[PDB]
Amino acid sequence: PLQSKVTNKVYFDISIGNPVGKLVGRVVIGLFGDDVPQTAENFRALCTGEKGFGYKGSAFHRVIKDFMIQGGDFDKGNGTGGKSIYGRTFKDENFNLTHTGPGTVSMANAGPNTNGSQFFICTVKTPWLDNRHVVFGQVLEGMDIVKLIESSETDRGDRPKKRVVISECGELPA
Amino acid sequence: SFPWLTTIVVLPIFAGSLIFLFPHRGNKVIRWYTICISMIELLLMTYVFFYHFQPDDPLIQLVEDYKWINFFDFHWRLGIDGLSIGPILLTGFITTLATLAAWPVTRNSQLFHFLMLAMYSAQIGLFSSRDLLLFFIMWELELIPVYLLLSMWGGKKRLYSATKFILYTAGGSIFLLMGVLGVGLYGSNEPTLNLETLVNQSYPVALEIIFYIGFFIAFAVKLPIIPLHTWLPDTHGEAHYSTCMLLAGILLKMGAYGLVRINMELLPHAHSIFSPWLMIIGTMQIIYAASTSPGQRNLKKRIAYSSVSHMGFIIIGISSITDTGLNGAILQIISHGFIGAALFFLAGTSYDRIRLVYLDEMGGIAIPMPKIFTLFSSFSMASLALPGMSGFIAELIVFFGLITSQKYLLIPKLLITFGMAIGMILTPIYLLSMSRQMFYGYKLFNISNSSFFDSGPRELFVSTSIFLPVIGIGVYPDLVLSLSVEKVEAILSNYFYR
Amino acid sequence: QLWLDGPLPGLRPAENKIGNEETGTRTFLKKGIYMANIGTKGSALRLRKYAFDLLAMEDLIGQDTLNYVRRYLRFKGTFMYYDFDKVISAAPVADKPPLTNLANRLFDNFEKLQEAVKLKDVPLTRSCYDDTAVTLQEVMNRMA
Amino acid sequence: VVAFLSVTSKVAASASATRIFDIPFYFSSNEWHLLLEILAILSMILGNLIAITQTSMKRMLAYSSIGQIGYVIIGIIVGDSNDGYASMITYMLFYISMNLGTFACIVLFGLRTGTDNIRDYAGLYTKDPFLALSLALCLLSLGGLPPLAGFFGKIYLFWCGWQAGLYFLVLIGLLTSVLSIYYYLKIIKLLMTGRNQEITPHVRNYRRSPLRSKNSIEFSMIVCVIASTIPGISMNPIITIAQD
Amino acid sequence: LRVEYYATTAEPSCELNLVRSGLGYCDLVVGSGVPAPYNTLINVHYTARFSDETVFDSSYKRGRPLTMRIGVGKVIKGLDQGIFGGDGVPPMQVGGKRKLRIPPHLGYGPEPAGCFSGDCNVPANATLLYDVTFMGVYSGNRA
């Protein structure tokens, strides 16, 4: 079940392939803007691209099977880039939300008060990430696409061998 | 079960590789062996078309699939349909007749006939290739034979023409290779180059447009499209007339065949985007070449610009999205392959006697040479879109395909219909003038030109054997159209709402 | 506007219920055929003329020329289908049911003839074409 | 010796460059990637442009070698993921035969003739058709002409470049390969001159002699390779993607 | 101070088995492979964080596991004791995942490391945290 009501709705268009990916489906993410306003606003603004920079053309740069997919690095694409709409980093809001299971979209940070533009979608229950990562969304549609991204073959690191690229990101009004 | 198409492709080049085992001098044994190979291959294609090709089948036929390279997922894949069998038969016919008409060649006859058989094999391999990289390889496999034929048996400016030809074709074909790489790597799981599975592929609009541009640059370099046509006048004007048969009858149609097979079939959305801009380009190409032709004093350059003008009707039939337009484009392909080759052959044979180039000094040739005058006049009439010939019915069917087209509404349908009409006013204006500057009038010729000067039995047979199908198609066009009415419909089936 | 932007329009559905009950359209219809817009009188004249053209198809029926029978049947069938739709849509309300019934019978005969052609059965083709022939004669008698 | 330094020096230096840019310098890939991209683009551009203005055969082959090395550099640039090092070999294996054949023909021609200028290569087809045929085949393989080894080697090198998203590198490689036809065709254009007035006296007094000689065997082990490896480009890569 | 920003999700927590040398460790995953051999090159994956859980280094950042000769003092003493073992620490096995808390005297000591151009990578007297993962023993050929 959903931990909170969905205020704003965002969606991704996932493309897998090399060098130009083929579209595989749509991933719809509902944002819990009531509990975490700043993080949800940051994610929505990066999805729409109103600030100039956004998730369009970015890639899911870290995939661990049966654990998590992680992306949101439009700057460098290796995990060392990404800026929020406020600054380079912004403070962790609060940790009332919990990694309740698959489809949980949370913030990936270098540490406390170091949230940026990088997010990760969990595919299993991760109760060890609570009080350390800001959970701000839930995947509503396209979980099969998320599992398809997870099943991608990976190199010696965790980068997928085939580039999983977000072709077009935005909002779906409801 | 038997590999018919593989045997057809392999046989000419494999037989020509053995032409160097002959220790004989001269050209007699070499040319008779080459014509034996050409006629055996022609009979083989005739057997294939008679017994294993079904014109009512819109699917691929006689397919053969052998995996050659695993990394590219690259297969030697061959297959024929209603689109390819016409060009294949035309290739065999024109190449055999060009081998027959290249008989006075006594300098390096072995290499000449080997290159002719290699050209045979390469053209047939292109026209029956169902793999994108195999298509690209067979496309590239003619840069060297045509270069050698031009540079060793051409005219006065043969070397510059050969260099320009090979550099222009390489410049187009690198864009062809980029398009091949882009289309063959779009697969999400594994690369694929088979045309059958690529005909169902779905692309975004921008990527489809980019791939279409990458293929269209190559197909506009090969099939002469303004302004990528500048290699053709000096390439065809300064080439051997036997090589001019293949250049103006077979190699020019390869760009159109690639346009139907790849641009029209594999990428229909980008083709629908680009076709209205192709119509204006084709009409301006007709007008531009039909106006450039009177400005050429050279006879062969005038014929080459006439070929550029005649390619505009093929471009129009391609861009007009109807079954009738595509049928007219195929009919014009066959008609031009029957007309331009014979015109170049007659020009070369006439030059072998008169030994003059510019039209303002070749008066009175009709007095010592009446039969070549008759053949030249008849093939000019065929060029003139005269009824009873294939050119008239091809242009008429292209006009009907434009008039019946649903993509364009009224005013462009007028301004294009008027457009090519201006072309068939300009097409007489030089052509008859050409004849008037090449055969009419009186000149005092030598007594030795009274006998053993006209066309012999061989040249008469060649001209008659290319002229007869022109009349046979101009009387009954469905001798050709019935081979491709079905498959063209399938090609059109992707252009409507689904 | 100069040219259409999207894909070309397909088979426009008839608004007189002359199509097949299960599918809403007939099998012999071909997309991409140019039909000239004349009106009810011109559609009636073309309907009669093309019924005569299809009754001129006895010679084409044979073991070797069934594909041309199918091609001519599809071409003329699309033409008379849309002409019949045009003339029923402009007919008086009292005359619409008999015209619709005649069109339905004619198009069922067209489907049966095409089905017989597909199996390459010549006596079946001849019998279906005889039924089509009496229906076409009825069509020209009605629309003279 | 220059043929040896053309084939042996590039193999060892390519191995050292691959083992010094991947094993101890993988953390700074974004720097030596740019360095190698500049080093390759400049190499093809300034090795194929100057080779078309050469009057000496060995110097033209030098500019040829410094042009073909840029194609191999793309294999390092793409990396081991999208094949890559498997495209360094299966092209260096090609390149060895291409250069050693096109240098063996030069060795025999110079020994029987006594010259190095390209203008003295005119009319060799009339004197020695076998040597002219072999040299033409080696040069056409050097230009990436279709039925010969260089064409498949270049499309293998460009497939991995396109797969890695290096459109600029592949485009420059294709444009420089187009430029790389005018030479490797100029020599053939000289070789097929039947004009006795343009034939240098260097080849007029040319004796082929009725003996085989060792270089003929050495380049018959080569000319039959650069043409008949074109089907066998599936046996070679499965030995080169097996390494990692 | 000169911390390169790397966004990585955290690892499961532990109870730290403190030893005589001051090192703390836990076995997140006990490896089923060969234990870390002495004087041998091994590839491991690590995520080096400072105190206050801020990551300053990671082998995932470079894209491949780090190769080091273990057991002969080519790394800091805390990493050697965590991986190779000894002094109450069992050796790690192939496939094993282990957390490590290196005190300052087992790390870089009271001297900052990587000092150049007005900043240093590691501050003085810093306790380091390592989520090491023994990927395997080094081999010339990969699968």
Ligand SMILES: CC1=C(/C=C/C(C)=C/C=C/C(C)=C/C=C\C=C(C)\C=C\C=C(C)\C=C\C2=C(C)CCCC2(C)C)C(C)(C)CCC1
């Ligand atoms: C497409 C094709 C083809 C086919 C074709 C055909 C199908 C044909 C037919 C044809 C026909 C079925 C015909 C009929 C008839 C004819 C006639 C009847 C003729 C006559 C003529 C005459 C008598 C004369 C002439 C002349 C000459 C020769 C020249 C000069 C001028 C004149 C005109 C005088 C081929 C195989 C080639 C191959 C390729 C493809």
